Write a protein that binds this DNA or RNA. Structure first.
Ligand SMILES: [Mg+2]
Ligand SMILES: [Mg+2]
Ligand SMILES: [Mg+2]
Ligand SMILES: [Mg+2]
Ligand SMILES: [Mg+2]
Ligand SMILES: [Mg+2]
Ligand SMILES: [Mg+2]
Ligand SMILES: [Mg+2]
Ligand SMILES: [Mg+2]
Ligand SMILES: [Mg+2]
Ligand SMILES: [Mg+2]
Ligand SMILES: [Mg+2]
Ligand SMILES: [Mg+2]
Ligand SMILES: [Mg+2]
Ligand SMILES: [Mg+2]
Lengths: 252, 117, 68, 234
RNA sequence: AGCGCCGUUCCGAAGGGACGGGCGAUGGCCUCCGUUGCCCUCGGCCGAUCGAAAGGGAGUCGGGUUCAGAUCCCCGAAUC
RNA sequence: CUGUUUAAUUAAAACAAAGCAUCGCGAAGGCCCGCGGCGGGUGUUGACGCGAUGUGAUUUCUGCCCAGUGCUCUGAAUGU
RNA sequence: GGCGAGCCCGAGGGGCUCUCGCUUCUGGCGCCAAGCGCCCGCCCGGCCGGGCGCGACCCGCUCCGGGGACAGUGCCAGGU
């Protein structure tokens, strides 16, 4: 039969991200001497709106200790920062909201965001609007630290990776209903073409594993495993359960 | 010596000037587009004739490989007259039409009678 | 005088004196490019019995292909 | 005296800028620089076989200076003095018609194909084996062959210095076969020390493995953990 | 296998420029200047290049003229 | 609901839609492309995100069955 | 090295054992070395223009971190 809708995402023809009007990739500073053995003053000049992102972007300018040139970077704007606040960064930086510092310095229960998986990749985990991570279980030997992620997973990471202290601003973004198709169309036109959302039962048999027949019924068990080939994994992909929840996660 | 920069690039090596052992075409290629080959036809129609009286301007048909400066030099080196300006168009048959307006010291009727049109 | 010793040392290419040099050369050549000019043959006996002579005009290219 | 003040700069973190330091160990080196440097480091890390750890166990510079002072006067002829001797001897045998003007020419031999033949036929009195040959397989059979044929061999560092006594870029081998009358004592004095160093210790060299040295950062880490273990045990 | 394909900053020794100083030489009216070579010093490209007759893009307007031209040609007045 | 569609026999009760849910995935990853490379899309992205589904505003509810077919967890204690 | 602390022996002093650094009220500025000490051609013990070192410690064998004989890659076999 025909190639399904799910297989067209890998071509990158019309399903790419709408990437021009974005301001830039939100990263931390590439780690160096001033952030591993001290701290350095930085000034947030203005916060801006990266399109396709509900979290605000912050434009923090630094000073280069090696050449006379003011370098400008793009942080994720933490909650409560304001233009003109001296955003500090480094190892021995004092714990305040906005100051990015490694997790080995901060105590347990420190609510941070925009942390790193590996030390030095400039911010990977907990970057969406209104999310945070919980820092627990430090270790003197075997430099590791548990972090509770926004999904509830407790990941053991290194002790040298960095994290901006605070939560990501823009929290509560999913509180308002979109309330019409128009704001959803403008939201997805800002983000990417992720919206040919057509029901797989309503579409044809030759184009989807579910559709067709004189009645709009699935006809097949929608719980389809991970060993299934491409064009087959539709519906519930490797579903360990279904139906209404009972507890929160029940996963060790 | 101290390498103060973390980036290593090519050193400025010595490049030799091209001093060939033999020329490669035995001779300079002669100028095919000379003064006698730039300016071909003096146009003698009604509108081209009206530019002699009412404009102090000759009309010529030029090979398309020439420009305003070569037309000006060709007129000054063939007809012994000075040129104020040269306007060029491409006539849609394929050739170039050049309206050569002369200096006010010269007379287009006299130049036309000397060239025979 | 020597090329028979070079040949017989190359034959048993699983011994410890050869496999170290072979592993070092495989690392050295894997970290190189795909097609490039080796200025002199690394196997002089094999190159000479295939037809290399040490004179101007014979060029050794070291080349890397993918197995399978 | 009037104004002439001192203007110091504080080079700490978060203040006045850092000066231009050496930056030697932090420059992005090219591919071939990294190739040869990690090649030397890889020879230091891995275990080399006992047939190539013979190399880097080589001749000291006093005996090498004595060896070069002996080898400098047995130099092979270059093209200029070769043609000079050919023209001179040809003119003398044409005019004076000399039957045997030269009895025996004393000159050494070069090249691995020549030296291996000379040690197989026991013509070699002394063998000089270069260190810096990039295919080591060309050279590895020669120490054991000179040992089993009883000819003394000395491993020397630098094939370019051996090429410059033969008027060539690389020489790789030098065989002393014929000695003069006033040089036999000096050659015996060299051969006695060379047999003391290399030939008499061949069963000692063949058992010893070379290389197997970790990086100095890892050695300092293991030494720090060893001092911590000794502090715990004491 | 291969015509070739992928990729556009990635795994690259991917700048042929310059304020200036020194040394040497040539040339013009060798006083005075203009050139050439060598050495020192300085100098992230966000990577060759293409891609809009509606995007960005300095500066011409008034009158008259032909059967057909017009901010283009003539006169007059300006600007880059 | 406003919207969209069988251009050239259908304009709809059809599709979409906000809302309600479910599942996979903490990047050496989830879902995909490619004949090929640790090559690409999501990704200038990081669970308030991405991908895949059922139902279809608001109000009130989401009955009972894991026998079957799927999906998933778990153990070399254990048949093949 | 104490403008800093430490933990003891202990009369000055000793380092069994460690902590490092010289920027936290402010939407300011910060580069192309001040200073010191040697060595050069010029005024008779005077003037100009230069070079070197300390400022900015010495040495070393991965650029620095995180994995690592696993993951992957090539072939073969069995599932789906
Ligand atoms: Mg909700
Ligand atoms: Mg939906
Ligand atoms: Mg739908
Ligand atoms: Mg249908
Ligand atoms: Mg099907
Ligand atoms: Mg050659
Ligand atoms: Mg262009
Ligand atoms: Mg018209
Ligand atoms: Mg007009
Ligand atoms: Mg109709
Ligand atoms: Mg993925
Ligand atoms: Mg409803
Ligand atoms: Mg039910
Ligand atoms: Mg490493
Ligand atoms: Mg390990």
């Amino acid at each position: 039969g025909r190639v399904i809708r799910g297989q067209r995402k890998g071509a990158g023809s019309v399903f790419r991200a709408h990437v021009k009007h974005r301001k830039g990739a939100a990263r931390l500073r590439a780690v160096d001497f001033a952030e591993r053995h001290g701290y350095i003053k930085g000034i947030v000049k203005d916060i801006i709106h990266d399109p396709g992102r509900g979290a605000p972007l912050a434009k923090v300018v630094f000073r280069d200790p090696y050449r006379f040139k003011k370098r400008t970077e793009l942080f994720i704007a933490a909650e409560g920062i304001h233009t003109g606040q001296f955003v500090y960064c480094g190892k021995k930086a004092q714990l305040n909201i906005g100051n990015v510092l490694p997790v080995g310095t901060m105590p347990e229960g420190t609510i941070v965001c925009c942390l790193e998986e590996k030390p030095g990749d400039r911010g990977k985990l907990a970057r969406a609007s209104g999310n945070y991570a919980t820092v627990i279980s430090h270790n003197p030997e075997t430099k590791k630290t548990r972090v509770k992620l926004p999904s509830g997973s407790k990941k053991v990471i290194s002790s040298a990776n960095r994290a901006v202290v605070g939560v990501v601003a823009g929290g509560g973004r999913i509180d308002k209903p979109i309330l019409k198709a128009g704001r959803a169309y403008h939201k997805y036109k800002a983000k990417r073409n992720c919206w040919p959302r057509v029901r797989g039962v309503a579409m044809n048999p030759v184009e989807h594993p579910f559709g067709g027949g004189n009645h709009q019924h699935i006809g097949k068990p929608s719980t389809i495993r991970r060993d299934a080939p491409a064009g087959r994994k539709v519906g519930l992909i490797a579903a360990r359960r279904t139906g209404r929840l009972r507890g929160t996660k029940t996963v060790q | 010596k101290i390498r103060t920069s973390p980036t290593f690039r090519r050193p400025k090596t010595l490049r030799l000037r091209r001093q060939p052992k033999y020329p490669r075409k035995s001779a300079p290629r002669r100028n095919k587009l000379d003064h006698y080959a730039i300016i071909k036809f003096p146009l003698t129609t009604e509108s081209a004739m009206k530019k002699i009286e009412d404009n102090n301007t000759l009309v010529f048909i030029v090979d398309v490989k020439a420009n305003k400066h070569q037309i000006k030099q060709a007129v000054k080196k063939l007809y012994d007259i000075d040129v104020a300006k040269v306007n060029t168009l491409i006539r849609p048959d394929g050739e170039k039409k050049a309206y050569v307006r002369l200096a006010p010291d010269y007379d287009a009727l006299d130049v036309a009678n000397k060239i025979g049109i | 005088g020597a090329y028979k010793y070079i040949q017989e040392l190359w034959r048993k290419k699983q011994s410890d004196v050869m496999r170290f040099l072979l592993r070092v050369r495989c690392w050295q050549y894997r970290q190189l490019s795909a097609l490039h000019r080796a200025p002199r043959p690394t196997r002089p006996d094999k190159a000479r019995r295939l037809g290399y002579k040490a004179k101007q005009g014979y060029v050794i290219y070291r080349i890397r292909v993918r197995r399978g | 005296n009037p104004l002439f003040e001192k203007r110091p700069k504080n080079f700490g973190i978060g203040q006045d800028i850092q000066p231009k330091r050496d930056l030697t160990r932090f420059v992005k080196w090219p591919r071939y620089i990294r190739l040869q440097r990690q090649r030397a480091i890889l020879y230091k890390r891995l275990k080399v076989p006992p047939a190539i750890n013979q190399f880097t166990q080589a001749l000291d510079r006093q005996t090498a200076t004595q060896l070069l002072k002996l080898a400098h006067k047995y130099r092979p002829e270059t093209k200029q003095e070769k043609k000079q001797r050919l023209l001179a001897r040809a003119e003398k045998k044409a005019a004076g018609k000399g039957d045997v003007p030269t009895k025996r020419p004393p000159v050494l031999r070069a090249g691995v194909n020549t030296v291996t033949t000379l040690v197989e036929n026991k013509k070699a009195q002394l063998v000089v084996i270069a260190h810096d040959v990039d295919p080591i397989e060309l050279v590895v059979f020669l120490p054991a062959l000179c040992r089993k044929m009883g000819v003394p061999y000395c491993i020397i560092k630098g094939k370019a210095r051996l090429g410059r006594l033969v008027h060539r870029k690389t020489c790789t081998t030098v065989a002393f076969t014929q000695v003069n009358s006033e040089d036999k004592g000096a050659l015996a004095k060299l051969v006695e020390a060379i047999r003391t160093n290399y030939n008499d210790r061949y069963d000692e060299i063949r058992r010893h493995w070379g290389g197997n040295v970790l990086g100095p950062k890892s050695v300092a880490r293991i030494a720090k953990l060893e001092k911590a273990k000794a502090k715990e045990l004491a």
